[PDB]
Design a protein around this ligand. Sequence first.
Ligand SMILES: CCCCCCCC/C=C/CCCCCCCC(=O)OC[C@H](O)CO
Ligand SMILES: CCCCCCCC/C=C\CCCCCCCC(=O)OC[C@H](O)CO
Ligand SMILES: CCCCCCCC/C=C\CCCCCCCC(=O)OC[C@H](O)CO
Ligand SMILES: CCCCCCCC/C=C\CCCCCCCC(=O)OC[C@H](O)CO
Ligand SMILES: CCCCCCCC/C=C\CCCCCCCC(=O)OC[C@H](O)CO
Ligand SMILES: [Cl-]
Ligand code: NA
Length: 392
Amino acid sequence: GPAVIASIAYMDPGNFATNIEGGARYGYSLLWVILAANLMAMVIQNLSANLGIASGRNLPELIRERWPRPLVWFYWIQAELVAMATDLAEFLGAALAIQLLTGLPMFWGAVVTGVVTFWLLNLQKRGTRPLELAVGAFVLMIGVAYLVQVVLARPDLAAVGAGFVPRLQGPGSAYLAVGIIGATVMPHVIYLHSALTQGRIQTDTTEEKRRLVRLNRVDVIAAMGLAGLINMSMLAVAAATFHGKNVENAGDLTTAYQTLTPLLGPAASVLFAVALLASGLSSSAVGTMAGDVIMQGFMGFHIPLWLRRLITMLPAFIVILLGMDPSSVLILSQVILCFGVPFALVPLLLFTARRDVMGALVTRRSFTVIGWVIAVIIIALNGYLLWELLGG
Ligand SMILES: CCCCCCCC/C=C/CCCCCCCC(=O)OC[C@H](O)CO
Ligand SMILES: CCCCCCCC/C=C\CCCCCCCC(=O)OC[C@H](O)CO
Ligand SMILES: CCCCCCCC/C=C\CCCCCCCC(=O)OC[C@H](O)CO
Ligand SMILES: CCCCCCCC/C=C\CCCCCCCC(=O)OC[C@H](O)CO
Ligand SMILES: CCCCCCCC/C=C\CCCCCCCC(=O)OC[C@H](O)CO
Ligand SMILES: [Cl-]
Ligand code: NA
């Protein structure tokens, strides 16, 4: 199931942190970012899936086989830094949820998260299917809980409507908008989606290829449509809960359960932390898997899976020992992810426009143009953020 295993990446602790902080701090004014980032991810992941189906190779493999050696090395290094920033929010997200449930310190929440992840990687595919369905049950129901709560919260509809008009509000709004974009336009999934779809054809025919393109387009847009509604609901619920009210630590993930207290009652604290834990544990295991596939595609070899798991844990323990706020680091990691998006888009936009790669499945010129517009917008947002964080 290519869409379902990677689907948890669109509901990782990074999405929780950016949705809650965005609503509590900036009200409904960033709803247009979630809508834009979700629409971009529809185009981008469609192209990524169409690359694996049409060519039979994933994006890192094609970069390795077609581009000069130093450019490939640069692309592996930046994708490796994307994998670490992706794992930091997910690993620390599960570690934070351990604290919300047991009260353990973050260091001990990370140790438990460390033991579970190490134990989770050794398991086979048949033993993880009950766990993958279980985490899907927790996260989906919490998502549906926000879809229902956004109605019951009675949000100010004048503010909700104005939030869909693209507007920024200070240098801090650009920082969180970039974090929202990276939390939905995830570069590691841009490389991963082309590998999930490679090797799903039956008789190598163009007719079988177009069919998998049609079927994937239906599944991606439907799943992205659901995740987008959940993300906007969670931000809108967080806005109706905390924005304007003078609540201490409003937007932090330790108090995010209060968004569902009128609906779930005293159970809201546990049901949010369990969903945050299942979100962080599964997406961290998926990312470690994806990080292995991406390295094998770029370099033709990999490091042992236990070594990759151990390396990506170090920035999580260091952040804990520095006393940094976990919700802050979750947001920052999503910001770093959004900076690796243009690097992923450039080969994706070039390869899906070539006939010697796609065959009869060359992307229509209009969507290639839409793809380059998306790349330019994200480059400019990353340039406006970098500029405002330096000076002026
Ligand atoms: C369904 C999930 C969609 C999520 C998309 C992003 C959030 C924007 C949606 C707002 C709908 C809220 C409707 C709640 C009712 C509107 C309030 C109203 O019209 O008056 C009711 C009155 O206050 C009672 O007495
Ligand atoms: C085809 C798949 C669906 C798209 C995938 C994402 C999932 C749903 C996203 C948004 C729902 C519609 C929200 C669009 C914004 C409606 C509010 C609006 O535009 O009117 C407000 C007015 O303009 C203020 O002045
Ligand atoms: C002035 C501020 C910027 C101005 C506005 C942004 C324009 C620059 C952004 C992208 C360039 C478009 C890249 C065009 C490269 C595609 C053409 C091409 O070479 O075809 C691809 C083929 O598939 C490969 O072999
Ligand atoms: C800036 C926000 C932009 C929002 C824009 C929303 C419209 C995108 C809707 C569906 C994705 C369409 C799929 C992307 C293009 C793939 C279809 C295609 O061209 O496929 C050709 C070939 O026949 C097969 O490989
Ligand atoms: C949701 C989209 C909002 C729409 C406004 C956003 C602006 C995006 C830029 C271009 C749109 C795509 C149109 C690209 C037209 C030039 C490329 C093209 O398609 O030329 C081939 C054509 O078939 C020869 O007849
Ligand atoms: Cl307001
Ligand atoms: Na926190």
